[PDB]
Structure formats: structure tokens, C-alpha cells
Assembly symmetry: D3
Homo-oligomer: 322 residues x 6
């Protein structure tokens, strides 16, 4: 067993690097205050956009971008080391390739102050977000109490194949950090439950409290059990700390022991009672197409939104918003 | 739009071919009565095991197995032609390959009395079910009111990749016929919603009212909108007819028009705003593994249930239970 | 199976025998209209006080009391014969013993116009009700679709021993007719479920819509399955007809077949696995006391309400309120 | 007022006396940890099977049986004395009659380390359980804050006459300890509420978290008020401590003061407004039959499950499973 | 009593007067179909924008504006006369004053084809709506079954003073027709209840199913009783007809008879028990200010949105958008 | 941000001044215990009737009446000063005009022990309450964390114009203290939400636990956000302390920044997009009538309850109950 905390962090309007700097210190203070309030906490999770805020007019500028690792990550690392916790942070990351747009990035730091996981948003929330598609796949790392942690970012949680990928690489606690999941709220709660059940793992998810100096009741905190049951649903309050005990080994034992419920095994081993080992070929043309890089929906040639021109982005490519 | 009916059919105990012919006449009587009571109905759906019941001591015997097509499906065809409806039926199907166990099969018959869809359960419920894993993939047919119909069977609905496959082939109304989906009731309801939302399609799902001559309140009927909202949830009553109006073209239009919510498009075109067309490589190791027939969970080594031995089934392959 | 209807009947203020005859014609009109609107209905149930209302200043007067049988029940009999339904009616009944207060009585009339069940409220609602405690025990009759019907009246439904008694005599559909079961609404719903589950029988229950010429949204209609699940809960509307299909034989089969859930059997055959037949002595001092007419709670000494003095009723016995 | 705690205790697989020994120490540690966490707690309740676990292959063997009192109870007593709490424990008890099967037993120990209540399961959960029917009736004892405590075991809570018996002997806080009440879950919650309302007493109930080294989310904790309202419903978590304040004197005052709600008085005093003292004869043939030891259901001669042969028990009698 | 129907009307995209005439014929077809399907219906209610849709680029153009009365309302009148129902329709109305923007208007037509009520939206939804604030106050008319009907439009229903005004003029059934009341869904449901309870009247309210050729599940239909209880809440389906029986005289009787609950009376007769007649001066500075045309919030000075500039509208007055 | 606490205070039967004295000390002890338990609490709220109880036979007597300020208020002031909190208290206040009935009064004391707000119930709960209508309007004061506080008493919360008045004078946290709001329970919860939403302010409300030495589960505690969402709903328990963090400046910023949601501004500025400044005349005859002191409902001449004669009060006027 271990105690997790998801922070419904309220981010003020961010207009400069100095605002970002104060925000980092706010996150750090919140981290220590949480560990003081909950002395047994081992994993503390901050929402998407909680470092740099949501200034859609400035968020592509060099002033608003960070390196991972960088001086800001080292401050987060120091705080994790002092508090002796795992921490999850959201950073809009300057692309090491200056000819590409920045990434939407998540890091897990351990109680030693080492970054043990770095994840780039694989499915940017299009057509609104300008972030370059992640190139680091879906990584998994060792966490507290026998957990194998993985993080996705917000809209990523809408993709069941991504939750499957985390599980397939060993994840038993799947973290989702979100920036604004309100107005897609039912579906966020829905997929947090389905991501858990489909894969026999816990899910721990958080949404940012707010970003606009006015309304800070958009926050969410949800912990789902490996059967898909919501164990904890937070109230929406600014600064709300949503907590619960997680037993990663119980998820592992379900995966080891269960028959009827073992859907993650059944996927690659269809009908193993009648056919020893199961049928290893799933069915399933989309799987073969996507592996080959030729996923194509039958209605693609009549679709309306296929680039960011509806929000004022170039449809050409390359770097922009400097 | 078209009106759909899902029948919470109660099957008695089945001890003979006499009892199976009785079920067939009962289903046909129910079909006509539903059309009489709901003149606008275009699609009538019967649950898994509604033809042959759930006699686990007899269900692999020749007496308990039918051909698809055969004289029995011809009777169902006659009824659909007479009622001028589409009908969905469950048949445990004799495998033409005598070295292999029977299939668990679903058919859709059109208002002309033609079988327009034949599907063999891809994911038998293991370790309890002895059905051979299906070999007809996930087919889609033309249905009423602009629908593209596909059917899965019970446990199939737990596999999110299979709902994706149906969608990828055009499905906008995904039918799940179920036989004993109680005791996993919460997870059944959950995935009926997630299957809909993930893929921007309707789901229409039904469970058998009962099978044991005693308890007939296991029935379910659930219709979900393409946003994942449950539109209709039936009461649990034997013989309950759960109906609802479906608008397949509205699902089509969502798929054509939506940007932020268009997860099915995003899967194969990740981050198309900064990279034109998006990245066609999703991630994503399990997809590539499964496509190649080499999906392997890291913990398969220590798993307890990988054959039907717990239920007394032989573990070496071939035809059994005759 | 048979279809049942419970009528959320609204009674006006009753100030005369003229008003009572008006209620009688209104109930009869409602009975015919229900049969017209629901051609399959076999059992129609009216609430407590639906014949004579709730005029606490007149309800013990000769003008406000009827004989059972009498010309009024003969009119109800005529209606049931004409409609070919079973009907349940409430009558405040003149006590043939002139030294005793009237009874609060319910009858069931069959489709032949015969009174096949007569029940006098065993547990008048005290201290407010002046009705003489019933002396006809808890009778059971033959009803439609294989049912064994029994009726209790309102406050009667709070006594779990009485639901047991009905069951012990064969009842598989237990009817509760109620007159002002608001303000105890939660406990009414609760016991309708527990009465069903405890005894493996259906419960069908109705409350009067209102009685005071102003507020007619006190009505309830609730049908519970033999497992205690509420199958139907009506909206609160005056004149609302709450209907549902009942399957009395399914309750019979549960009682015949069930082991773990068969609490009604267990009561008189405790632990039959280690002791054949079980122990026939349940425990159990109150049972023996009550059987002997000597049930006495340890705190009776200090109880505040043991007569009708709070309501102005005489405390010495005999006929009053004439 | 006093604070109660119900422990959703997780029991590991038990294969030997040494496993039982470690389990006892686990319970003891949990007891002290609870009192440390909740300094005001006065009553701490452990679930059914929490001492010896659930090893249905070994639970009738001498190695798996204890005496009450015995060295194991004295360890529980010592812990209660040190912590200064009342504690409730579950013990499968070797029958002092070697020709009879063991009992399913519950004890209450006071803050002095004295066993002040010993209860043997009156209604073993047949046909699965081998325990001999209890012979100690339904005892009641003095507890904290003016409570009169009684305990039933699991399936016992399904019998309303047993809750009535506790109340009749003075109980105002009725404790139910359960081993696996999941899958009869709705009905457990239902009867915890009805047992309370019927008798104007609090109910405090707990279910074992799990028993199989895999799944530990079967736990329940429920506190009902004397009006039947659920005051506290725990989340299901291993090790969850469900707490609430109980005011036993408030239950007593309701019993002393109430009229309309006083169903427990009405049972033995039907219609006391019309008939001074009420009618002392309830109605009620089953009551007379059960007092005489001749409770007989009309359908008994056609029942299917009347001995433990469906699970592999002798139908002869005597001691077995050594 | 009378039966009411609220239509969850789906409007396509409207790009022309051709499309508006199409909506008109669609509404008329719907009106007849509703009467055919619900023979007892006396009042049929269509949502805001159901005639002309929600084309914010064209909605102020002459092509998109109608006269009230005009040839279009005459067609609606013909339909109501033919169907013998009362109908409620939404019309964006050309302002006869050419220096002023059009009104957002609702009419009620009686079964004789007469316009018996004309209302211009008093509270346009600002800053998004350009409609001139209504100048016909809050009128009330005679409706079916003893009703006094009044209609407000969408955002109007957020103003509790306006529901009071309708009531003060006699209204006992308050109709709210709405066009895009999603995203404020919780507050819409809430105020429909509070408008009813505050004033002891029924509320009947409807929202448009959709307007954008894609999503038509925004529809709502809600009927609240005069105590504030929701009697009927429709499912969200395009074309859904939400019906319910209304009893206007029961609301009248509450207003006549009730004491404690009679808040509408209390407002103008505060504390009439110690001061005969009550105090006629309510308090109460805003009432006096608003009456005098000088309502001013203390923070108006620092408010951000006090004109339509955020939406591109001119801020200086006069007719625009032609 | 600041933490509020509402106390579900249980008041015993009060028969003398000495009982009142002990009750005051009980309130004081509760105040200190709350601040000790919740060290960050800044505002502590006691329910209506919590000082003098509810003795309807004695509550108009001089012995049962207090002065405000007086020696009893000074004891409350001392406690607030020592604990360094704002406190809200209920006092039945002797009228300084001996020819008038006493007031139902509420006070707010600050952490300096100064009474900073005094409010007399404007709308006594007629026809039951004898209190003289309040003459101090609806005052507002400065509270903790940038709040502007106002209090209403119980039935006052049923009047939306009163909540509007508080807001209009700057209130951003509207407190409602209630004596017995049960049986008007739904409507209390309803209006706590609507009072919040209508005015974009928080509401914090509490009901007295009980008053009769028997039942103390009538308590309520509810905190609503400025969007009308219930943030905290207490369980009903005697002595329950319902707490939550309030961010008064967030309410202020919503009022400053919002457009579509800004109903409080729209009331006095109807249609400001089309007409610069909005239309300042609301509509609205009742407003003009009430400002002029001639509020008159159309049905007033046929109303039944217009004085306290139904409960035994003089209909003449003046002082009574001495």
C-alpha cells in the first residue's frame, strides 16, 4: 500500500517568466504543505499547465518555454528530495529541434530528486493545441509500494490503446494530468474508469482548478480501482488535495490470478480453452494498418477539421509562435 | 432515424432439441408481437444463448448444435421477412471442421429474409466457454435508417480494440448480445458507454433475462449515444422490450465534423496541427506485437489460468464435449 | 404473468354520505377507465380511505360507516364483474358488535363479482386511529396468473411478522394499501422492499394521492420483486396509474429451489446441514411470549403513549365517536 | 454518545495454526492502531472469519478450531484491556460436544478484558456452512455510552425475528459481522436499515475485506440510525476503518416517547386506542407454530435444497471434517 | 387537469428564408403528429429559435426576421385551429421602429387560431444576443383546464423577479422556452424548480434539441410541481415529446389555503400575526431603486462586460446587423 | 480563503431562565471546542432558537426574552474574543417597545467581541410564529477573508428578493440560520442553491439538530458555491460540525468579470447590447406596487390563512403572551 495525492492546483494568469517563477515556487510550497498535511504520502501529482499556466497568446514564445531537464526541473527535484516523495509535473518543453514546435511534457521525479520518467503528449488536443506529437512513446517507471507508473496527458486518456500500451509495459497505476477537462467532463470520468477496468490497473487522475484569475472550480480528482470502480471522487475546490491508498500488488495479483476478468490476456490469446494458447491473430484490420502506418478511416475524404486553420495556425508545418 | 428493440428474453432450461425448437418458436412469437406492439420498429435484437440456452452439460453435443445457415435460421428468416424487420439471433454453430469445437455465432437477417451478417464470437469467455475463437473478423452490414451495423457477443464487448475495429470498418450502431453478464453488471454498463464514446457510435446492448427456470431478472437493455451517454436503460423484467430511436447519420456527422472530440481520427493522425497529416506511427509496442501475432504480457509466466483445466476441459486441443 | 395497476387515487374532502357515494362512483369510473386503458390488467388496487376519505371529525359516525358486504360493496362487485378484473377496495366497516369501534377493512373482489378476501386492519395506526384491531387474521386468496394474494393496510406494512404470516400461508403477492404514508415515506419504501426480500414474494403497494382538497401529490405506487428490488416506483401525480407485470410462479420457484437465499425456510429449520431437519426451536423469547399473549417490552413501564389521550380519545374502552 | 469503529479487515490465506497465530497478532495490531488513530473510540468491531480466515478445505479440522474462552481469546482480552476498548471478535469454536460440529461464534470483550457476551450463529448459512446451530439464543450485554449490545453473524441479519429478539431483550445497538456478504450486497444493506427501523435501534455492520490473497475490496461498513437512515456507509477499501458517533439513549427515548413510529410496541399491543392495552394476540399462526416447534411452510414437501449434499456434506448428522 | 407536451425540436442550420419556411412546415407537421399521438393534449410548446434557428451571421438581416402577426404566424394559427390545441411558438420579430433592433418574441395561439398572448424577451442573453429588450411586460392569458399561462424566454428564467411578476398577475403555469440552455444546464433545471416553488405555480420548460446539423442531444423538457418538485424530466433525444398532466386549480388552492408555505403572500404582508395585515414595506432598497429606474450594483464601476464589444457589436445604439 | 463552520447544535427542553443560562454555556463550550478542533476556522454559525430553545408555551414570556445587546450577548462576545472568531447567534429579543411582540434576532460578533451585525427576522414564519416583523432591513457587514456577510433567519431564505437585497448591498456570503426546516427540507436545500446562483454569492446554511429531548437528527449544514452547486452537504448528526473553505473574492471576480452568467446585473440593465446601459425599467408591476406599499395578489380576497387564529393568537394586534 501507498498514499497518493492529486492536487487541484489553481494557476493565476501568467504574463512573464517572472510569473512562471512565482508559480514554480507556489507548486513547491504546495508540495511541502501536502507532505506536512499527509505525512504518509508517497506520490504527489500536479495537473497539466500548472507550471506555465494557460496563456494561449504567449505559450509558444521562448520566454514561456523550458528545457527538460533545466533549472526549473532541478528546483522541482530539490523539493521532491527534501520532501522524500515522488512528484509529477507538467512542463511545456522547448523542442531541442528548433525547426519543430515545443512539446507538452510530463515528468516523474523520485524521492532522490532524479527524473525517472519523461513523457511527451502523444496526442495533442487538436485542433486547439500547437504542441508537437510526442516521440518518446509511453514510458513506464518504478514507483512507491511496488507500483509501475505511467503518465498520460489529458486528451491522451481518451485513447484506450494508450492505456493498453502502459499496461502492456507493466503499468499498474496509470496517471492522467489534465489542463481543462470540464465540458468533456462525463467522458473524462468515464474513460478514467474504463482505462482501469480494461487493463486491470489503478487510475489516478487530476484536473487543473482553473487558469483565468476568476473561476477555480474546474478541478477534479479521481482514483479508480482495477475493476473500474471509482474509489475516490474529489469535490471541486481550489487547492483540494484528493487522496487515497493504492495497493499496486493487488492489481498485479488480479492479472496473475483471474480468468473471466482477464481481458488484457484474452486480447492476445482469444479462445484458449478450445485452442491451446489462444488465437494470436486478434481479428482486426485496424491493428495491422496502424502497425504499418496506414490507418485510414472510410470517411476521411469528407472530414472537415484536419488542420489548425479553424484557430489560426499555419497548415504548412515547421516552427511557429516565436 | 429508426426505432430499435432489445428483448430481455427468458430462456427455460434446455434439455433437448425439443426445448430448442420451443425456444425458436418462442423467439419468433416474440418477434411478431414486438412488431405488432411497436409498428415503427426496424431492428429487433435477441440475447446470446436465446436459441439453445445454457446447458453446460449438453452444449457441445451434436443435439445442441445447429448449422448456419440451416432449417432453423430459415425459420428466423421467414419471421423477419413476414414482419419486415431486421433481426439479430444467437446460434451455437456446428464447426464444419470436425477437429474443432463449435462457434458461438450471431446473425443479422434483413426484412427480405436474407442473412446479411454472420459473426463468430472472437473472444469466447474463458476459462468457462469452450467455443472456438471466431474466424470471420468483425463484419459490418447495411442496416435501417442509414446504419452500418456490427454485432459482438457478450465478453467481446470488454475488448475496446474490437469496438474500434467495428468503427474502423464503418459501424455507427454497435450491437452487443449477452447471455450472463450479471456479476459483471457494472463493467458491462461501463464498456457499453466507453465503446460508444471512444468511437463516436451508438451502442445497443442486451442481456438474457435468465436461463435456469427460477430467476429471470438478469435482463438488461442499454442504448448509449455516440457521446457515451446512456439514452435508455431498461428495467430488469423478463420479456422486457427496451426500445429507443437511433439516428445513425448524427453519429456520421460527428465523425465528419468534430475536431476536439474526434479521438478515432486522432489515433492515426497524432498532432496534425504542428505536423501536417499527423504522425502515422501511434507509439506503441503492443499494436505492432499484436499485428505480428506476438502479443505477450510481461507477466504471462506466472499466470494461473491459461487453459480450461479449472473447469475440467482437456488442455491439448481438438474437438471435445460431444 | 399478470399485469397489476395501483391507483394513486385522490379523495376530496368528505363531509357527507353524498360525498361517499361520489367517491364510490369515481372509483368505479376509474376502475373501468383503467381496464379500457390497460386491456391486459387483471388486478386493480385502490388505496386506504379511498371510499370514505379522512374526515377525523366524522369518521366514527354512522353516516360514515358501511357494512361489508352491503349495497356499496355490491356496486364495487358489479364493476369488477363488468370489467372482468380483481379489485382491491378500502371500507371503514361498521362493527356488528355495538360495544366496539368500527374496523378499517380491505376486500378483494374477483372477476365474477365475488368477495374472495376480507381483511380487517390488524395494526391500527396509534394513537391517531380509533379502529378496532382486526380479528380475521391475515387471510390469503387465489388471484390471477397463479398468485396467492394477501392485503395489509398501511401501518400493517411496518410489522415484518405480518408479511411473514402472509407468506407462511402461501402469499406470493403482498398488497399494501395506504392512506397517509407521507412523512414516513422513506420507511414505507424501505419496508415494501424488506417485506418482499424477507419472504421471497412480490410486494405491490399504493398510497392515496391526497385527501384535503388542496394537495394531491402524496401518492405512491411501488412494486418490488421477491429479491427486494424495486421494479416500479411511480411518479407522484394524482390519478397516476402505476402498472407492472408480476410473475407469481417465479417467486414460487425461488421458494422451492433456493438454498442460500431461502431465509423463510431457514427460520424453522436452523442449520440443517449438521443437524438433519434443523433445529425447530428458533431461539427466541419474544416468539414464545407473543404466542402466549404475554409480549412485554422491558421499558413499557416508562412509555409516554399507551392510549389515545393525546388525541382526545377516551381511554376506558367501548364504542365512541358516534 | 460514543464512537464506534468497524474494521474492513483483510485476511490472508490460512493454511496452518501458525497462519492463525500471525492473524491474531495482525488483528491485535489493528486494534491498537485504531485506538491510536481514533483516541475517542470505545467499540471496535472485527468481521466474521477474521481470526481463522476462510479455508473451506481445512476449517473443520482440529488445527483450525479454538476454544472460547481459550489462549487466543485471552490475547484478545489483553489487547482490549490495554487499549481500554470494547472489542468484537469472530471465532470458529470447537464444540465441547465432540459428537457435534463446531460453532460459528462471536464475542464481545470489555475494557477490563472480560468476555461479556458470547454468541453462537443461530442460522448457519445453508447449504454451504457446516456449523452447528447456535444454542445460546440471542444474548444482550451492557456496552459503552448507555448501549445494550447484541451481535448477529452475517446471514443471521437476514432474519427479522432475530433483530426483534435482540430489541425485545433491550438491545439498542445491533451489531452484524459478516464474512462474505457481497453478491447478496443490496439485501445486506437493505436489512441493516430494516433491522434498525423495525426495532428503533442503531445497527452497526461490517463485512470482511477479502480472504483469497487476491481481492480485498469486498469490505463494507454501515451504520444505520434508529429511523432506518444510513448515517455512515464506508467506501470499500482493505483496512478501511468505518466510524460514527452513536447515541444509544436517543434510541431509548424514541422507544419511550414515540407513538406513530412505535412499531415494536404495536406488535404486542395492536389497536390500543380502541381496546385498552391493545389486542395481545397478534394474528399470526406462524408465531404459534414456531413457539410450538411446528413451523411448516405449505410448499416444504416440494423443496429441493434441504441438506448439504449439494456441497459434499453428509446428510446423516454427527461430527465430520476432522 | 390538462395534458401538456414540450417538443425537443431539432432545427437544422438555417441559411435562407427557404430554410425558415422549411422549419415552419416541420413545426406544423410536428404539431399535428403530437395531437395524433396524444389525443388528450391541449398545450404544445416549441423551443426558442425553433422557427428561424441560430445563424448568428444572418439573424439580424431582413430575410431572417418576421412580423408578429404576419403570414407565418397565420400558418401556425391555422395549425392550432385545425388541431384544436394551444401552441407556443418562437419568432424573431422585426421591430416596427427602424432605429431599434428586432425582438425575440414568443406567442401563444389558442384552439380558435387566435394569438392570445404576445411576449417580447425582457432579458436578452447578453453580451451574445442583440435583441432589443422587450416592451410588453410579462403578460398572462387564459389557457386550458383553468390555467393562467405566461411565457418567458430562456435567460428570462434566470430572473426570479420575473417569475414573481407572472405569478402576481395570476399565472399558475409558467412556460420557459429555451434555445441553447446547455453549459448552464444545472442552473436551468435549478431555476425551473425555484421559479415553481417560490410562487406556488407549475413550471413547464423546454430546450431546443440542437441547431448545428451535427449534435441534437441538447434538448430538455422539464415539468415542475408548485412545491418545486420535478414531476417529469425528459430524456435527451431529438424530437422527444415530454408530456405531463397539470392541475392548475391545485396550484390555485395552495395559494388560497396554505399558510406556512405561502411565501408569495408573505412578501407583501410580513408578520401579519403580531401586526394585523402585516408590514407592507418589505425592507428593501433594491426594490425601491429598481422601481424608480435607478438599480445600481455597488461594483458596476469595475465591471468588464457592459456592452457587446467582446462579440464585435457596436456600442453606441441604433439598428445594426442588417 | 477562509474556513466556515456551521454547528448542528442540539438544544434540550428549556423550562426556565436557568435552562437558558446552561444553554448559553453549552453554546460557548461548543464554540471553543470547534476552534480547538478546527484551528483555522474564522466563522462559526449557530442555528435559530439555539439560545432559548423552542418552548412554544413560554417563548413569549419575559423570563424567556433577552436584550440585544445584554449580559448574554456579552458572554457570547467574550467567547468570540477569546477564540478569535466571528460568531453567529440566535436571540429572541424583548422589544424595546413594550407595546409590541418580541423580535426573532440574529447577531454577528467579530474576533474583537463587537457585535458588527444585528438582524431582525423580516418575514416571521406565519401563521405559527408570534415575532414582530423586523425593522432593521437586511444589513451587511465585513467578515473574514474579504467577505461581506449577511444573515437571514430560516423562512426568510424562502424569499428570493431578500437574497437579492443582501447581494445588492454587497453581500458575497449569505448565511441562513434555521430552527426547524425539516418537512420543508427539499425546498430549503433548493433555495440555498438558488439564492447563491441568482446573486453570484456563497450561501452557508444551518438547521438546529433538535429541540425536544428525544430526536436530534433534524440538523442540516449546507455550503453552496456562487454557481449554485452544493459544495458541502453535511450528514445529519447531533453536534455535527459542517465545514468548508470559502473564497469571497472569487464571488466578487465572477460579478466583475462574467457576462452570460451575470443575472444580477441584467436585472437592472436588460438588453444592454441593443440598448446602451440596458433598459432600466424591469417590466414588472409587482416591483412598483411593493415599492409603493400596495402589493396585492389577485386572489387575496378569497384566502383562508391571513392571521394567527388557527394557532390561538389574537387578531387584534399589540403585545401578548406575557
Amino acid at each position: 500500500g501507498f498514499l497518493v495525492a492529486a492536487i487541484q492546483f489553481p494557476v493565476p494568469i501568467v504574463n512573464s517568466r517572472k510569473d512562471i517563477d512565482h508559480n514554480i515556487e507556489s507548486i513547491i510550497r504546495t508540495l511541502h504543505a501536502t507532505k506536512a498535511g499527509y505525512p504518509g504520502v508517497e506520490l504527489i501529482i500536479f495537473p497539466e499547465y500548472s507550471t506555465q499556466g494557460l496563456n494561449t497568446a504567449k505559450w509558444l514564445s521562448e520566454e514561456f518555454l523550458l528545457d527538460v531537464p533545466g533549472k526549473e526541473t532541478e528546483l522541482y527535484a530539490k523539493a521532491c528530495k527534501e520532501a522524500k516523495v515522488y512528484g509529477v509535473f507538467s512542463i511545456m518543453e522547448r523542442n531541442p529541434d528548433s525547426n519543430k514546435n515545443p512539446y507538452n511534457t510530463a515528468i516523474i521525479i523520485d524521492p532522490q530528486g532524479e527524473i525517472i520518467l519523461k513523457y511527451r503528449k502523444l496526442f495533442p488536443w487538436n485542433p486547439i493545441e500547437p504542441w508537437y506529437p510526442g516521440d518518446l512513446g509511453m514510458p513506464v517507471c518504478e514507483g512507491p509500494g511496488g507500483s509501475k507508473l505511467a503518465v498520460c496527458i489529458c486528451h491522451d486518456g481518451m485513447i484506450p490503446e494508450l492505456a493498453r500500451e502502459a499496461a502492456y509495459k507493466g503499468c499498474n497505476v496509470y496517471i492522467r494530468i489534465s489542463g481543462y477537462s470540464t465540458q468533456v467532463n462525463d467522458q473524462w470520468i468515464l474513460t478514467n474508469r474504463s482505462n482501469a477496468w480494461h487493463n486491470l490497473m489503478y487510475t489516478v487522475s487530476v484536473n487543473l482548478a482553473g487558469y483565468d484569475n476568476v473561476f477555480y472550480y474546474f478541478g477534479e480528482g479521481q482514483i479508480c480501482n482495477f475493476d473500474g470502480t471509482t474509489l475516490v471522487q474529489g469535490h471541486r475546490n481550489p487547492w483540494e488535495i484528493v487522496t487515497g491508498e493504492i495497493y499496486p500488488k493487488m492489481a498485479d495479483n488480479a492479472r496473475l490470478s483471474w480468468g473471466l476478468e482477464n481481458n488484457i490476456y484474452n486480447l492476445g490469446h482469444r479462445g484458449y480453452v478450445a485452442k491451446p494458447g489462444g488465437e494470436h491473430d486478434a481479428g482486426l484490420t485496424y491493428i495491422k494498418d496502424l502497425a504499418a502506418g496506414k490507418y485510414k478511416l472510410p470517411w476521411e475524404d469528407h472530414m472537415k477539421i484536419k488542420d489548425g486553420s479553424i484557430y489560426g495556425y499555419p497548415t504548412t508545418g515547421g516552427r511557429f509562435g516565436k
